[PDB]
Write a protein that binds this ligand. Structure first.
Ligand SMILES: Cn1nc(O)c(C[C@H](N)C(=O)O)n1
Ligand SMILES: Cn1nc(O)c(C[C@H](N)C(=O)O)n1
Ligand SMILES: [Cl-]
Ligand SMILES: [Cl-]
Ligand SMILES: [Cl-]
Ligand SMILES: [Li+]
Ligand SMILES: [Li+]
Lengths: 263, 264
Protein backbone atom coordinates (compact mmCIF):
# COMPACT_ATOMS: atom_id res chain seq x y z
CA UNK A 1 0.00 0.00 0.00
CA UNK A 2 0.89 3.66 -0.05
CA UNK A 3 3.64 4.91 2.20
CA UNK A 4 2.53 5.60 5.76
CA UNK A 5 4.19 7.55 8.54
CA UNK A 6 6.25 5.19 10.70
CA UNK A 7 5.38 5.36 14.41
CA UNK A 8 8.61 5.47 16.43
CA UNK A 9 8.42 4.60 20.11
CA UNK A 10 11.17 6.09 22.27
CA UNK A 11 11.74 7.11 25.89
CA UNK A 12 12.29 10.55 27.47
CA UNK A 13 15.81 9.85 28.74
CA UNK A 14 18.64 12.38 28.50
CA UNK A 15 20.69 12.73 26.33
CA UNK A 16 18.83 10.33 23.99
CA UNK A 17 15.52 12.25 23.83
CA UNK A 18 15.00 15.58 25.62
CA UNK A 19 12.45 18.40 25.49
CA UNK A 20 13.84 21.22 23.39
CA UNK A 21 13.85 24.75 24.63
CA UNK A 22 10.54 26.31 23.56
CA UNK A 23 8.87 22.89 23.24
CA UNK A 24 5.71 24.42 24.73
CA UNK A 25 5.01 26.13 21.37
CA UNK A 26 6.39 23.41 19.06
CA UNK A 27 4.71 20.42 17.48
CA UNK A 28 5.64 16.95 16.36
CA UNK A 29 9.26 15.87 16.09
CA UNK A 30 10.42 19.47 16.59
CA UNK A 31 9.56 19.21 20.31
CA UNK A 32 12.55 16.91 20.88
CA UNK A 33 16.35 16.85 20.63
CA UNK A 34 19.10 14.38 21.47
CA UNK A 35 21.17 11.39 20.37
CA UNK A 36 18.18 9.23 19.35
CA UNK A 37 16.41 12.17 17.71
CA UNK A 38 19.48 12.61 15.50
CA UNK A 39 19.75 8.82 15.00
CA UNK A 40 16.08 8.52 14.00
CA UNK A 41 16.58 11.21 11.36
CA UNK A 42 19.63 9.38 9.95
CA UNK A 43 17.92 5.97 9.88
CA UNK A 44 14.81 7.42 8.23
CA UNK A 45 16.91 9.18 5.59
CA UNK A 46 18.89 6.05 4.71
CA UNK A 47 15.75 3.86 4.67
CA UNK A 48 13.39 6.27 2.89
CA UNK A 49 10.55 6.68 5.40
CA UNK A 50 8.68 9.50 7.16
CA UNK A 51 8.14 9.12 10.88
CA UNK A 52 6.57 10.48 14.06
CA UNK A 53 8.36 10.26 17.41
CA UNK A 54 6.04 9.11 20.21
CA UNK A 55 7.11 8.85 23.84
CA UNK A 56 6.26 5.45 25.34
CA UNK A 57 3.06 5.81 27.35
CA UNK A 58 4.17 4.05 30.54
CA UNK A 59 7.73 5.43 30.51
CA UNK A 60 9.32 1.95 30.66
CA UNK A 61 11.95 0.08 28.66
CA UNK A 62 10.12 -3.24 28.72
CA UNK A 63 9.59 -6.36 30.80
CA UNK A 64 7.12 -9.24 30.82
CA UNK A 65 4.81 -9.68 33.82
CA UNK A 66 5.53 -13.10 35.30
CA UNK A 67 1.84 -13.76 36.03
CA UNK A 68 -0.09 -12.16 33.15
CA UNK A 69 2.75 -12.62 30.60
CA UNK A 70 1.98 -9.11 29.26
CA UNK A 71 4.87 -6.98 27.98
CA UNK A 72 5.14 -3.35 29.06
CA UNK A 73 7.29 -0.45 27.90
CA UNK A 74 8.66 0.06 24.43
CA UNK A 75 8.85 -3.73 23.94
CA UNK A 76 5.11 -3.98 24.58
CA UNK A 77 4.34 -1.19 22.16
CA UNK A 78 6.05 -3.23 19.42
CA UNK A 79 4.60 -6.58 20.57
CA UNK A 80 0.99 -5.31 20.57
CA UNK A 81 1.23 -3.31 17.34
CA UNK A 82 1.15 0.22 18.80
CA UNK A 83 4.47 1.28 17.24
CA UNK A 84 6.41 0.28 14.11
CA UNK A 85 9.98 0.73 15.42
CA UNK A 86 11.77 1.59 18.68
CA UNK A 87 14.73 3.97 18.45
CA UNK A 88 16.02 4.20 22.01
CA UNK A 89 18.73 2.83 24.34
CA UNK A 90 16.96 -0.54 24.41
CA UNK A 91 19.25 -3.37 25.47
CA UNK A 92 19.42 -6.53 23.33
CA UNK A 93 18.53 -9.46 25.62
CA UNK A 94 17.47 -13.08 25.11
CA UNK A 95 13.93 -12.67 26.44
CA UNK A 96 13.37 -9.60 24.25
CA UNK A 97 14.98 -11.19 21.18
CA UNK A 98 12.43 -14.00 21.43
CA UNK A 99 9.51 -11.58 20.87
CA UNK A 100 10.90 -8.66 18.79
CA UNK A 101 13.57 -8.16 16.13
CA UNK A 102 16.78 -6.19 16.81
CA UNK A 103 19.40 -4.57 14.61
CA UNK A 104 23.02 -5.22 15.29
CA UNK A 105 24.20 -2.90 18.09
CA UNK A 106 24.47 0.85 17.65
CA UNK A 107 26.18 1.21 21.08
CA UNK A 108 28.24 -1.16 23.24
CA UNK A 109 27.97 -1.04 27.04
CA UNK A 110 27.68 -2.94 30.31
CA UNK A 111 26.16 -2.71 33.75
CA UNK A 112 28.19 -0.40 36.02
CA UNK A 113 28.22 1.24 39.47
CA UNK A 114 27.47 4.94 40.11
CA UNK A 115 28.60 6.43 43.44
CA UNK A 116 28.58 9.83 45.07
CA UNK A 117 32.22 10.96 44.95
CA UNK A 118 34.11 9.76 48.02
CA UNK A 119 31.94 6.69 48.65
CA UNK A 120 34.28 3.84 49.82
CA UNK A 121 33.16 1.35 47.17
CA UNK A 122 35.24 0.17 44.19
CA UNK A 123 33.40 -2.92 42.91
CA UNK A 124 30.27 -5.05 43.00
CA UNK A 125 32.10 -7.40 45.38
CA UNK A 126 32.56 -4.45 47.77
CA UNK A 127 28.83 -3.67 47.64
CA UNK A 128 27.92 -7.31 48.29
CA UNK A 129 30.10 -7.59 51.43
CA UNK A 130 28.55 -4.70 53.38
CA UNK A 131 25.16 -3.25 54.40
CA UNK A 132 25.76 0.42 55.30
CA UNK A 133 25.45 1.56 51.66
CA UNK A 134 22.18 0.61 50.00
CA UNK A 135 22.04 -0.06 46.27
CA UNK A 136 19.47 -0.77 43.58
CA UNK A 137 18.48 -0.69 39.91
CA UNK A 138 15.85 0.60 37.50
CA UNK A 139 12.47 -1.16 37.29
CA UNK A 140 11.12 -2.95 34.22
CA UNK A 141 14.34 -3.55 32.32
CA UNK A 142 17.44 -5.52 31.57
CA UNK A 143 19.55 -4.52 34.62
CA UNK A 144 16.98 -5.71 37.14
CA UNK A 145 16.55 -8.93 35.11
CA UNK A 146 20.34 -9.45 35.09
CA UNK A 147 20.43 -9.59 38.88
CA UNK A 148 17.20 -11.63 39.21
CA UNK A 149 18.58 -14.34 36.93
CA UNK A 150 22.25 -14.32 37.92
CA UNK A 151 23.80 -17.48 39.31
CA UNK A 152 27.16 -15.73 39.95
CA UNK A 153 27.73 -15.67 43.73
CA UNK A 154 28.37 -11.91 44.07
CA UNK A 155 25.41 -10.90 41.88
CA UNK A 156 23.18 -13.53 43.52
CA UNK A 157 24.01 -12.10 46.95
CA UNK A 158 23.29 -8.59 45.64
CA UNK A 159 19.88 -9.64 44.24
CA UNK A 160 18.94 -11.44 47.47
CA UNK A 161 19.58 -8.17 49.34
CA UNK A 162 17.95 -5.84 46.79
CA UNK A 163 14.75 -7.83 46.36
CA UNK A 164 13.90 -7.63 50.08
CA UNK A 165 15.41 -4.25 51.01
CA UNK A 166 13.09 -1.83 52.83
CA UNK A 167 12.43 0.86 51.81
CA UNK A 168 12.60 -0.21 48.16
CA UNK A 169 15.95 0.30 46.46
CA UNK A 170 14.42 0.22 42.99
CA UNK A 171 13.56 3.37 41.01
CA UNK A 172 11.01 4.03 38.27
CA UNK A 173 13.24 6.25 36.10
CA UNK A 174 16.97 6.72 35.65
CA UNK A 175 16.66 10.33 36.87
CA UNK A 176 15.21 9.11 40.20
CA UNK A 177 18.25 6.84 40.64
CA UNK A 178 20.66 9.70 39.95
CA UNK A 179 18.84 11.89 42.48
CA UNK A 180 19.00 9.17 45.11
CA UNK A 181 22.78 8.87 44.69
CA UNK A 182 23.20 12.64 44.82
CA UNK A 183 21.02 13.19 47.90
CA UNK A 184 21.99 10.16 50.03
CA UNK A 185 25.36 11.36 51.43
CA UNK A 186 27.15 8.31 50.08
CA UNK A 187 24.64 5.82 51.49
CA UNK A 188 23.12 4.82 48.12
CA UNK A 189 24.89 3.49 45.01
CA UNK A 190 23.06 2.94 41.70
CA UNK A 191 23.47 0.05 39.25
CA UNK A 192 22.96 1.33 35.70
CA UNK A 193 24.47 1.00 32.26
CA UNK A 194 27.93 2.48 31.65
CA UNK A 195 26.67 4.81 28.89
CA UNK A 196 24.44 6.70 31.27
CA UNK A 197 26.97 6.57 34.09
CA UNK A 198 29.54 8.25 31.80
CA UNK A 199 26.98 10.87 30.72
CA UNK A 200 26.03 11.86 34.26
CA UNK A 201 29.69 12.09 35.29
CA UNK A 202 29.88 15.02 32.80
CA UNK A 203 26.83 16.86 34.18
CA UNK A 204 26.69 19.45 36.95
CA UNK A 205 27.23 19.37 39.85
CA UNK A 206 29.92 16.83 38.85
CA UNK A 207 29.42 14.89 42.08
CA UNK A 208 29.08 11.31 40.76
CA UNK A 209 31.48 8.82 39.27
CA UNK A 210 31.65 5.40 37.70
CA UNK A 211 33.60 2.78 39.66
CA UNK A 212 34.75 -0.72 38.84
CA UNK A 213 34.69 -2.61 35.61
CA UNK A 214 31.52 -3.30 33.74
CA UNK A 215 29.69 -6.42 34.93
CA UNK A 216 28.74 -7.60 31.42
CA UNK A 217 29.13 -6.75 27.71
CA UNK A 218 26.06 -6.04 25.63
CA UNK A 219 24.51 -3.67 23.13
CA UNK A 220 21.59 -1.40 22.26
CA UNK A 221 19.61 -2.29 19.14
CA UNK A 222 16.95 -0.67 17.00
CA UNK A 223 13.89 -2.86 17.47
CA UNK A 224 10.97 -3.80 15.24
CA UNK A 225 8.01 -6.16 15.56
CA UNK A 226 8.98 -9.74 14.88
CA UNK A 227 9.13 -10.32 11.14
CA UNK A 228 8.60 -6.69 10.15
CA UNK A 229 9.91 -5.97 6.68
CA UNK A 230 11.46 -2.76 8.09
CA UNK A 231 14.17 -4.63 10.04
CA UNK A 232 16.49 -5.43 7.16
CA UNK A 233 16.96 -1.87 5.86
CA UNK A 234 17.28 -0.51 9.40
CA UNK A 235 20.03 -2.99 10.28
CA UNK A 236 22.03 -2.15 7.14
CA UNK A 237 21.65 1.53 8.03
CA UNK A 238 23.01 0.98 11.55
CA UNK A 239 26.07 -0.80 10.18
CA UNK A 240 26.70 1.91 7.56
CA UNK A 241 26.36 4.71 10.11
CA UNK A 242 28.78 2.94 12.44
CA UNK A 243 31.36 2.32 9.71
CA UNK A 244 31.16 5.94 8.48
CA UNK A 245 31.98 7.21 11.99
CA UNK A 246 28.60 8.89 12.45
CA UNK A 247 27.60 6.98 15.60
CA UNK A 248 30.92 7.89 17.26
CA UNK A 249 30.34 11.53 16.25
CA UNK A 250 26.88 11.52 17.81
CA UNK A 251 28.10 10.05 21.10
CA UNK A 252 30.87 12.65 21.30
CA UNK A 253 28.38 15.45 20.49
CA UNK A 254 25.86 14.60 23.19
CA UNK A 255 28.23 13.25 25.90
CA UNK A 256 31.46 15.22 25.72
CA UNK A 257 31.22 18.27 23.46
CA UNK A 258 28.21 19.39 25.56
CA UNK A 259 29.77 18.30 28.89
CA UNK A 260 29.36 20.61 31.95
CA UNK A 261 32.36 19.41 34.03
CA UNK A 262 35.20 20.92 32.02
CA UNK A 263 37.60 19.69 29.39
CA UNK B 1 30.33 -35.95 4.40
CA UNK B 2 27.96 -37.67 6.84
CA UNK B 3 24.30 -36.68 6.93
CA UNK B 4 23.04 -34.33 9.66
CA UNK B 5 26.61 -33.05 10.24
CA UNK B 6 27.04 -29.27 10.25
CA UNK B 7 30.22 -28.19 8.44
CA UNK B 8 31.95 -25.44 10.47
CA UNK B 9 34.45 -23.20 8.72
CA UNK B 10 37.01 -21.53 11.01
CA UNK B 11 40.55 -20.12 10.80
CA UNK B 12 43.88 -21.08 12.42
CA UNK B 13 44.37 -18.00 14.59
CA UNK B 14 45.62 -18.10 18.19
CA UNK B 15 43.99 -18.33 20.74
CA UNK B 16 40.75 -18.95 18.81
CA UNK B 17 41.76 -22.16 16.99
CA UNK B 18 45.12 -23.84 17.46
CA UNK B 19 46.64 -27.25 16.72
CA UNK B 20 46.93 -29.30 19.89
CA UNK B 21 50.28 -30.72 20.93
CA UNK B 22 50.74 -34.10 19.24
CA UNK B 23 47.80 -33.32 16.92
CA UNK B 24 49.45 -35.50 14.26
CA UNK B 25 48.18 -38.65 16.03
CA UNK B 26 44.73 -37.09 16.75
CA UNK B 27 41.76 -37.07 14.38
CA UNK B 28 38.75 -34.94 13.54
CA UNK B 29 37.59 -32.19 15.88
CA UNK B 30 40.02 -33.41 18.59
CA UNK B 31 42.99 -32.00 16.60
CA UNK B 32 42.06 -28.45 17.64
CA UNK B 33 41.75 -26.33 20.76
CA UNK B 34 40.93 -22.75 21.58
CA UNK B 35 38.24 -20.18 22.29
CA UNK B 36 36.26 -20.91 19.12
CA UNK B 37 36.65 -24.68 19.51
CA UNK B 38 35.05 -24.40 22.97
CA UNK B 39 32.43 -21.98 21.59
CA UNK B 40 31.53 -24.36 18.74
CA UNK B 41 30.97 -27.17 21.25
CA UNK B 42 28.70 -24.92 23.36
CA UNK B 43 26.69 -23.66 20.38
CA UNK B 44 26.28 -27.19 18.98
CA UNK B 45 25.13 -28.48 22.37
CA UNK B 46 22.51 -25.75 22.78
CA UNK B 47 21.28 -26.13 19.20
CA UNK B 48 21.37 -29.94 19.11
CA UNK B 49 23.62 -30.65 16.13
CA UNK B 50 26.69 -32.73 15.32
CA UNK B 51 29.48 -30.87 13.52
CA UNK B 52 32.81 -31.09 11.72
CA UNK B 53 35.46 -28.42 12.18
CA UNK B 54 37.25 -27.48 8.94
CA UNK B 55 39.96 -24.90 8.48
CA UNK B 56 39.22 -22.40 5.71
CA UNK B 57 41.08 -23.50 2.61
CA UNK B 58 42.63 -20.16 1.63
CA UNK B 59 43.34 -18.99 5.20
CA UNK B 60 41.33 -15.77 4.82
CA UNK B 61 38.54 -14.03 6.73
CA UNK B 62 36.70 -12.91 3.62
CA UNK B 63 36.49 -10.15 1.03
CA UNK B 64 34.93 -9.75 -2.40
CA UNK B 65 37.53 -9.63 -5.14
CA UNK B 66 37.11 -6.26 -6.84
CA UNK B 67 37.69 -7.70 -10.34
CA UNK B 68 36.24 -11.22 -10.26
CA UNK B 69 33.57 -10.27 -7.67
CA UNK B 70 34.04 -13.69 -6.06
CA UNK B 71 34.05 -13.86 -2.26
CA UNK B 72 37.06 -15.51 -0.64
CA UNK B 73 37.77 -16.73 2.90
CA UNK B 74 35.20 -18.04 5.34
CA UNK B 75 32.61 -15.67 3.87
CA UNK B 76 33.10 -17.35 0.49
CA UNK B 77 32.77 -20.82 2.02
CA UNK B 78 29.31 -19.83 3.25
CA UNK B 79 28.29 -17.93 0.11
CA UNK B 80 29.12 -20.80 -2.27
CA UNK B 81 27.74 -23.56 -0.04
CA UNK B 82 30.96 -25.26 1.11
CA UNK B 83 30.23 -24.70 4.82
CA UNK B 84 27.07 -24.44 6.92
CA UNK B 85 28.34 -22.04 9.62
CA UNK B 86 31.47 -20.00 10.45
CA UNK B 87 32.58 -19.92 14.09
CA UNK B 88 35.59 -17.62 14.15
CA UNK B 89 36.66 -14.02 14.98
CA UNK B 90 34.74 -12.82 11.93
CA UNK B 91 33.83 -9.16 12.10
CA UNK B 92 30.23 -8.06 11.45
CA UNK B 93 30.34 -5.55 8.58
CA UNK B 94 27.91 -4.01 6.11
CA UNK B 95 29.30 -5.69 2.99
CA UNK B 96 29.34 -9.10 4.70
CA UNK B 97 25.86 -8.63 6.20
CA UNK B 98 24.49 -8.09 2.69
CA UNK B 99 25.53 -11.62 1.64
CA UNK B 100 25.48 -13.76 4.84
CA UNK B 101 23.54 -13.84 8.12
CA UNK B 102 25.18 -13.01 11.48
CA UNK B 103 24.28 -13.64 15.10
CA UNK B 104 24.37 -10.82 17.58
CA UNK B 105 28.00 -10.34 18.70
CA UNK B 106 29.82 -12.82 20.89
CA UNK B 107 32.79 -10.44 21.41
CA UNK B 108 33.14 -6.65 21.26
CA UNK B 109 36.35 -5.03 19.97
CA UNK B 110 37.88 -2.36 17.73
CA UNK B 111 40.79 -1.66 15.40
CA UNK B 112 43.94 -0.81 17.37
CA UNK B 113 47.66 -0.03 16.93
CA UNK B 114 50.45 -2.47 17.78
CA UNK B 115 53.96 -1.06 18.17
CA UNK B 116 57.32 -2.45 19.13
CA UNK B 117 57.96 -1.14 22.64
CA UNK B 118 59.66 2.26 22.55
CA UNK B 119 58.25 3.36 19.20
CA UNK B 120 57.41 7.14 19.37
CA UNK B 121 53.77 6.67 18.35
CA UNK B 122 50.71 7.15 20.55
CA UNK B 123 47.79 7.44 18.08
CA UNK B 124 46.58 7.00 14.52
CA UNK B 125 46.99 10.75 14.11
CA UNK B 126 50.65 10.33 15.06
CA UNK B 127 51.05 7.65 12.37
CA UNK B 128 49.33 9.77 9.73
CA UNK B 129 51.58 12.80 10.32
CA UNK B 130 54.94 11.09 9.70
CA UNK B 131 56.68 8.79 7.22
CA UNK B 132 59.64 7.21 9.05
CA UNK B 133 57.47 4.48 10.60
CA UNK B 134 55.58 2.36 8.08
CA UNK B 135 52.25 0.77 8.93
CA UNK B 136 49.71 -1.58 7.40
CA UNK B 137 46.87 -4.07 7.86
CA UNK B 138 45.81 -7.62 7.10
CA UNK B 139 44.65 -8.40 3.57
CA UNK B 140 41.16 -9.60 2.67
CA UNK B 141 39.26 -8.47 5.73
CA UNK B 142 37.40 -5.81 7.61
CA UNK B 143 40.36 -3.68 8.78
CA UNK B 144 41.66 -3.01 5.28
CA UNK B 145 38.13 -2.18 4.10
CA UNK B 146 37.63 0.18 7.06
CA UNK B 147 40.51 2.39 5.90
CA UNK B 148 39.69 2.01 2.18
CA UNK B 149 36.17 3.36 2.75
CA UNK B 150 36.71 5.91 5.54
CA UNK B 151 36.18 9.62 4.86
CA UNK B 152 37.60 10.62 8.26
CA UNK B 153 40.55 12.89 7.50
CA UNK B 154 43.14 10.94 9.53
CA UNK B 155 42.03 7.53 8.25
CA UNK B 156 41.75 8.73 4.64
CA UNK B 157 45.31 10.08 4.94
CA UNK B 158 46.47 6.72 6.30
CA UNK B 159 44.75 4.81 3.47
CA UNK B 160 46.25 7.08 0.80
CA UNK B 161 49.69 6.24 2.19
CA UNK B 162 49.14 2.51 2.76
CA UNK B 163 47.62 1.70 -0.62
CA UNK B 164 50.73 2.95 -2.49
CA UNK B 165 53.50 2.12 0.00
CA UNK B 166 56.40 0.09 -1.41
CA UNK B 167 57.25 -2.56 -0.42
CA UNK B 168 53.67 -3.53 0.44
CA UNK B 169 52.61 -2.75 4.00
CA UNK B 170 49.86 -5.41 3.87
CA UNK B 171 50.34 -8.95 5.20
CA UNK B 172 48.71 -12.31 4.39
CA UNK B 173 48.17 -13.47 8.01
CA UNK B 174 47.94 -11.83 11.44
CA UNK B 175 51.10 -13.65 12.53
CA UNK B 176 53.05 -12.06 9.68
CA UNK B 177 51.99 -8.58 10.80
CA UNK B 178 53.09 -9.30 14.36
CA UNK B 179 56.42 -10.73 13.16
CA UNK B 180 56.99 -7.60 11.05
CA UNK B 181 56.51 -5.35 14.08
CA UNK B 182 58.95 -7.45 16.05
CA UNK B 183 61.65 -7.54 13.36
CA UNK B 184 61.50 -3.93 12.13
CA UNK B 185 63.30 -2.19 15.01
CA UNK B 186 60.35 0.14 15.55
CA UNK B 187 59.92 1.09 11.89
CA UNK B 188 56.68 -0.81 11.37
CA UNK B 189 53.40 -0.57 13.26
CA UNK B 190 50.50 -2.98 12.68
CA UNK B 191 46.78 -2.15 12.61
CA UNK B 192 44.78 -5.08 14.01
CA UNK B 193 41.84 -5.76 16.28
CA UNK B 194 42.26 -5.05 20.00
CA UNK B 195 41.49 -8.66 21.07
CA UNK B 196 44.59 -9.97 19.34
CA UNK B 197 46.70 -6.97 20.28
CA UNK B 198 45.96 -7.58 23.98
CA UNK B 199 46.65 -11.32 23.67
CA UNK B 200 50.06 -10.77 22.09
CA UNK B 201 51.13 -8.02 24.55
CA UNK B 202 51.07 -10.51 27.46
CA UNK B 203 53.16 -13.18 25.67
CA UNK B 204 56.88 -13.70 25.16
CA UNK B 205 59.04 -12.09 23.85
CA UNK B 206 57.11 -9.21 25.50
CA UNK B 207 58.25 -6.66 22.95
CA UNK B 208 54.92 -5.33 21.61
CA UNK B 209 52.18 -3.17 23.03
CA UNK B 210 48.86 -1.57 22.22
CA UNK B 211 48.83 2.24 22.03
CA UNK B 212 45.95 4.67 21.79
CA UNK B 213 42.24 4.08 21.97
CA UNK B 214 40.41 1.80 19.59
CA UNK B 215 39.50 3.43 16.28
CA UNK B 216 35.99 1.92 16.10
CA UNK B 217 33.51 -0.23 18.06
CA UNK B 218 32.48 -3.48 16.38
CA UNK B 219 31.68 -7.14 17.06
CA UNK B 220 32.39 -10.73 16.02
CA UNK B 221 29.36 -12.77 14.97
CA UNK B 222 28.61 -16.39 14.16
CA UNK B 223 27.78 -16.46 10.46
CA UNK B 224 25.48 -18.64 8.38
CA UNK B 225 24.38 -18.64 4.74
CA UNK B 226 21.65 -16.12 4.09
CA UNK B 227 18.32 -17.57 5.15
CA UNK B 228 19.74 -20.72 6.73
CA UNK B 229 17.38 -22.40 9.17
CA UNK B 230 20.29 -22.60 11.64
CA UNK B 231 20.58 -18.85 12.19
CA UNK B 232 17.75 -18.36 14.66
CA UNK B 233 18.86 -21.04 17.16
CA UNK B 234 22.51 -20.01 16.89
CA UNK B 235 21.61 -16.38 17.68
CA UNK B 236 19.55 -17.35 20.74
CA UNK B 237 22.45 -19.56 21.88
CA UNK B 238 24.96 -16.71 21.67
CA UNK B 239 22.68 -14.48 23.75
CA UNK B 240 22.11 -17.21 26.36
CA UNK B 241 25.83 -17.98 26.63
CA UNK B 242 26.58 -14.29 27.12
CA UNK B 243 23.89 -13.89 29.76
CA UNK B 244 25.11 -17.00 31.69
CA UNK B 245 28.61 -15.52 31.90
CA UNK B 246 30.09 -18.27 29.74
CA UNK B 247 31.53 -16.01 27.03
CA UNK B 248 33.42 -14.00 29.66
CA UNK B 249 34.61 -17.29 31.23
CA UNK B 250 35.94 -18.49 27.88
CA UNK B 251 37.71 -15.17 27.25
CA UNK B 252 39.32 -15.30 30.69
CA UNK B 253 40.52 -18.86 30.04
CA UNK B 254 42.11 -18.32 26.64
CA UNK B 255 43.53 -14.87 27.51
CA UNK B 256 44.75 -16.20 30.94
CA UNK B 257 48.01 -14.46 31.92
CA UNK B 258 50.61 -16.92 33.18
CA UNK B 259 53.18 -14.18 33.70
CA UNK B 260 55.39 -14.53 30.65
CA UNK B 261 55.99 -10.76 30.81
CA UNK B 262 56.60 -9.42 34.29
CA UNK B 263 54.95 -10.66 37.48
CA UNK B 264 51.68 -12.01 36.08
C1 LIG C 1 21.11 3.66 31.89
N1 LIG C 1 20.30 2.44 31.97
N2 LIG C 1 20.44 1.55 32.96
C2 LIG C 1 19.47 0.70 32.67
O1 LIG C 1 19.18 -0.39 33.41
C3 LIG C 1 18.76 1.09 31.52
C4 LIG C 1 17.61 0.41 30.77
C5 LIG C 1 18.05 -0.65 29.75
N3 LIG C 1 18.77 -0.02 28.62
C6 LIG C 1 16.92 -1.50 29.12
O2 LIG C 1 16.76 -1.67 27.91
O3 LIG C 1 16.11 -2.05 30.02
N4 LIG C 1 19.31 2.21 31.10
C1 LIG D 1 43.23 -9.45 14.87
N1 LIG D 1 42.56 -9.12 13.63
N2 LIG D 1 42.79 -7.98 12.98
C2 LIG D 1 42.04 -8.14 11.90
O1 LIG D 1 41.97 -7.21 10.93
C3 LIG D 1 41.38 -9.39 11.92
C4 LIG D 1 40.39 -9.98 10.91
C5 LIG D 1 38.92 -9.51 11.08
N3 LIG D 1 38.32 -10.06 12.32
C6 LIG D 1 38.07 -9.84 9.83
O2 LIG D 1 36.90 -10.42 10.07
O3 LIG D 1 38.41 -9.55 8.70
N4 LIG D 1 41.73 -10.00 13.04
CL1 LIG E 1 0.47 8.41 7.15
CL1 LIG F 1 52.90 -31.18 17.99
CL1 LIG G 1 37.10 14.22 9.63
LI1 LIG H 1 14.17 -11.17 18.19
LI1 LIG I 1 23.42 -10.46 6.51
Amino acid sequence: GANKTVVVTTILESPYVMMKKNHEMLEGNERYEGYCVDLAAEIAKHCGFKYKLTIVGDGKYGARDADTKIWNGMVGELVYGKADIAIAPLTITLVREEVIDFSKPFMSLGISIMIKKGTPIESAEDLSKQTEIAYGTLDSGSTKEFFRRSKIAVFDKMWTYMRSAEPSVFVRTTAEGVARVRKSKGKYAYLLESTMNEYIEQRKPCDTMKVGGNLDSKGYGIATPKGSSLGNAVNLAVLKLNEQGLLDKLKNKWWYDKGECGS
